[PDB]
Amino acid sequence: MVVVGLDVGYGDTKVIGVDGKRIIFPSRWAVTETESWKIPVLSTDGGQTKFIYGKYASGNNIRVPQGDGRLASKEAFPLIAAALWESGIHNPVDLVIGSGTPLGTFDLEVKAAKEALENKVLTVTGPEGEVRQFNITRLIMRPQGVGAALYLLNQGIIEQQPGYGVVIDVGSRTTDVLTINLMDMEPVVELSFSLQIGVGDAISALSRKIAKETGFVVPFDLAQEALSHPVMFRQKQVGGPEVSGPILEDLANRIIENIRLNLRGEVDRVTSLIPVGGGSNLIGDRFEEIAPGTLVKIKPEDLQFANALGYRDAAERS
Known part of the structure; x- marks a missing residue:
């Protein structure tokens, strides 16, 4: 019902939300033992484990992805939660996520991602103890690079x-x-x-x-x-x-x-x-x-986002 584009890069996580708003933040997170919730503190397990992400994740023990498009990995999960939190999309919202992963291990990572994420309820706790819940109904995937080419085609930049x-x-x-x-x-x-x-x-x-x-x-x-x-x-x-x-x-x-x-x-x-x-x-x-x-x-307004924009386009056309 709500469609989002998501690209969890080694470097940065990009999100294409509703009405074409974009989000980007560093693919970094760190566990915090603060009792607290400018700097959001999130949890996916009701406070048993909490983390800070993006430009604020600091100190030792920063976690980062093993590579691009590793959506089933432990390292990616807090970043996916943070992406959904940052989108501001709110209600239990039913989502279709359009994403992607490198071609070389495309079938393996797609299978793993679907198993990790599809038909799961994700419950994220944040500042002031607010809870936002997301029902991932479907994950649509395209090879990294194909997302960008489809976006450029749709924009008339290639033919x-x-x-x-x-x-x-x-x-x-x-x-x-x-x-x-x-x-x-x-x-x-x-x-x-x-x-x-x-x-x-x-x-x-x-x-x-x-x-x-x-x-x-x-x-x-x-x-x-x-x-x-x-x-x-x-x-x-x-x-x-x-x-x-x-x-x-x-x-x-x-x-x-x-x-x-x-x-x-x-x-x-x-x-x-x-x-x-x-x-x-x-x-x-x-x-x-x-x-x-x-x-x-590619226009500078688009270099970091081109795949994510194509991924979202592909999910929409589903």
Whole structure:
């Protein structure tokens, strides 16, 4: 009855709610033993266990997903609860959730997700002891990358034709490459794959470089900032584009080389190259060299949300 799009990324969790409102928050949570409920405290078991999530999850013992689209995992469950809480959708609300997961283990993760989530009543307790209840009636799933391609098609940004779309999703830990046949919008399994490299490799490389030069061990979140602009750490300015530039080009070069090897001659069928994910803000333009003239640049208002918008579209059309 209420349809929502949900995308639980390794990095960030995105929600498409009612009337096109969007939510995004960091895929992070931490258990709290406070008796308390700006900083919401939630529980899915009536207070036996409580947690804080998003930008407030702090300290030690922060929990994060093992990867993108791991909706059946223990690490994902508090984030799913938090997503539904943040949506503000309220009543026991009957939901259809449109979501997705990487193609390589699509059938396995879809089966697990349905078992974990479908026909379950989720009861979330929050501030002031308020309870919100959600009846998950149906979970509709599409491969990561297909969500984005379907959204772009619906928006008129790409068009069905002979040839392939290649969606390159640069995340923190992995790069998910989904090749789609534009004749029917179906994935080409032989040309779709997951590279174990992402922005975190650039962040680690910049951290090592800072440490080698200054002795400082910069926190991860600060090093990520230092990719785009110089930062202060222990009363010294470190990083920024002069330093991050060559490391980011190296990341791009490795992805491009691996895509070329995997696509081989089929690159000649590529008519649209579609960089998505957080990493594409940093290096997306570089992917044009795989197939000059085919680059589709997603509006910034949409890069982090493109899959979630497609997932929601697919559930609606159910």
